[PDB]
């Protein structure tokens, strides 16, 4: 497997020893917050650092596209006609004290999120689609009627009944049902309001993963040791340490061999890392899209709907396409990205092979000739004295709300402004300078929307169920440019329809959506990204494959 020029795995020619200590770090300038219950945890840093311990007790394995497969701590099966997901825990699934993981432990996760007495921030409207769960959530019911136990609470099977099936239910991260267990017998006598701050969920938890936390240093680190009761094979390693490292100290830590692996390293730091001997740098495509937005309307908050009613030459499809074709995204990525940005052909990255195809063509190749032709044929005619096109005596002049963030952000925006000059479009930065991130978020998300920008850039961390209703639907506040198109609405709905419970149909629906979005050009995909990870050359079995389910048990070292 390759991701760009990067290897996804480090194929160590040397065998792993039996034993050893692996030292891993996560780059963060903010402390970890240890919370072992998924429902009560809001810290992404700790969520990653929980990996050796089971990832906050995740149950389901997936393929490399995040589609559920059998063979993990539990299996999940959908039955359309029952409207039910059935979760079957393995016979051998135990907690790290040797207690059995039972059906109650899965139901208890739902209580931790849905009963407000626990203080969870993770309730979502999606959960209201489980029979009886909204009523449990609001106190109307004392149990969750939609969750049943074919073989009792102390058996291994849980049935979850829905009001409606959803096609995303075969993707991890879908949110319509949950994927973790919580140790009910261990935690049952803690008052719900005290659970999140209990030692039992912070410093001294029970877990289900290949390692268990022997010591947690608040804000900083976890020492992991083998979990005797893990259902899989014993791990190779005798211990793993997982520590927070600051951005400012990561490279030196690599120089000093303090860590074998550092995760979360940002795109900036790379050329300091890429030359360091003794490391193999692996890469993987990120769950990420960046894109260019055109401002085409406003958001009606009272009616929760985008109205595409702004006066702008960008209402013309030809103009939107031309401005897309004029960019030099590939060249910009070559010049500046250190290889960590690659041009997007579509709005969904190819991580999701079941929802994407490289056959989908977008604006990944500059085409100034096409851009100039589109504008000409739309009556935007090139003025001799100025070098800019006009229609009814008005120049084609746009405001670009480019933002701070990328290290070469200024330079990149200027690249684009210069390409746009080549097609006779005059483009200036919003107030003559880059917008700070918080100001940009405010500008884009405060209804009804501003009228003083034309072009902007946005970027998103995508969920492993990648429907984009929350980004581009007519009702979405995140639809920053406020387009509303009947064909796109039909396409978005088709992706989430009952017919899309069939994966071949859903693929086709995603592909049509991606093509239609490109053609309409209300938004223009810009880049995908690559995450990089330095790995000490002694590490054996390391891979960033999203399909690799057993890495913590398999990983080892070739020498102590």
């Amino acid at each position: 497997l390759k991701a760009g020029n990067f290897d996804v795995a480090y194929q160590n020619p040397d065998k792993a020893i039996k034993g050893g200590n692996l030292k891993v770090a996560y780059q963060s300038d903010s402390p970890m917050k240890a919370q072992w219950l998924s429902g009560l945890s809001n810290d992404a840093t700790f969520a990653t650092m929980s990996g050796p311990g089971g990832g906050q007790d995740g149950l389901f394995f997936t393929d490399s596209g995040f589609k559920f497969i059998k063979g993990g701590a539990a299996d999940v099966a959908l039955d359309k006609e029952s409207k039910t997901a059935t979760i079957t825990l393995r016979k051998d699934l135990k907690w790290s004290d040797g207690s059995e993981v039972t059906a109650k432990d899965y139901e208890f996760t739902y209580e931790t999120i849905a009963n407000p007495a626990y203080g969870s921030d993770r309730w979502t409207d999606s959960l209201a689609n489980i029979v009886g769960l909204s009523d449990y959530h609001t106190g109307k019911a004392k149990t969750i009627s939609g969750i049943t136990f074919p073989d009792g609470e102390n058996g291994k099977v849980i049935k979850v009944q829905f009001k409606e099936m959803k096609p995303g239910m075969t993707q991890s991260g879908n949110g319509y049902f949950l994927e973790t267990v919580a140790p009910y017998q261990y935690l049952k006598d803690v008052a719900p309001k005290d659970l999140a701050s209990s030692p039992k969920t912070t410093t001294k938890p029970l877990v289900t993963g290949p390692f268990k936390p022997e010591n947690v240093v608040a804000g900083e680190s976890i020492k992991y040791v083998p979990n005797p009761y893990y259902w899989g094979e014993k791990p190779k390693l005798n211990s793993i340490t997982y520590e927070v490292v600051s951005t400012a100290k990561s490279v030196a830590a690599l120089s000093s061999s303090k860590y074998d692996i550092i995760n979360g390293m940002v795109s900036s730091q790379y050329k300091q890392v890429k030359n360091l001997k003794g490391y193999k740098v692996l890469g993987q495509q990120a769950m990420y899209i960046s894109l260019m937005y055109y401002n085409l309307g406003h958001y009606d908050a009272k009616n929760s709907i985008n109205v595409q009613d702004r006066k702008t030459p960008l209402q013309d499809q030809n103009v939107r396409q031309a401005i897309g074709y004029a960019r030099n995204v590939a060249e910009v990525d070559n010049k500046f990205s250190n290889g960590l940005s690659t041009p997007a052909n579509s709005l969904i990255p190819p991580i999701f092979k079941q929802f994407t195809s490289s056959s989908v063509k977008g604006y990944e190749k500059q085409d100034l000739d096409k851009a100039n032709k589109l504008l000409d044929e739309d009556g935007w005619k090139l003025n001799k004295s100025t070098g800019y096109r006009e229609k009814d005596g008005k120049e084609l002049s746009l405001v670009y709300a480019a933002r701070v963030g990328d290290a070469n952000a200024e330079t990149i925006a200027q690249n684009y402004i210069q390409q746009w000059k080549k097609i006779g479009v005059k483009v200036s930065l919003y107030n003559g300078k880059l917008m700070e991130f918080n100001s940009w978020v405010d500008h884009m998300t405060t209804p009804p929307g501003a009228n003083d920008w034309d072009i902007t850039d946005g970027s998103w961390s995508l969920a492993s169920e990648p429907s984009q209703q929350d980004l581009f639907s007519a009702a979405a506040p995140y639809n920053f440019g406020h387009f509303n198109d009947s064909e796109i609405t039909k396409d978005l709905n088709d992706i989430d329809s009952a017919k899309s419970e069939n994966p071949t149909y859903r693929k086709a629906a995603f592909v049509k959506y991606q093509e239609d979005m490109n053609k309409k050009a209300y938004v223009i995909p810009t880049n995908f990204m690559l995450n990089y990870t330095p790995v000490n050359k002694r590490v054996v079995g390391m891979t960033l494959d999203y399909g690799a389910m057993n890495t913590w048990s398999e990983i080892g070292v070739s020498s102590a």
Binding site: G175, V441, S459, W460, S461, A463, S467, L471
Partner: peptide, 5 residues
């Protein structure tokens, strides 16, 4: 499900 970033 998706967040700015």
């Amino acid at each position: 499900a998706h967040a700015k970033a």
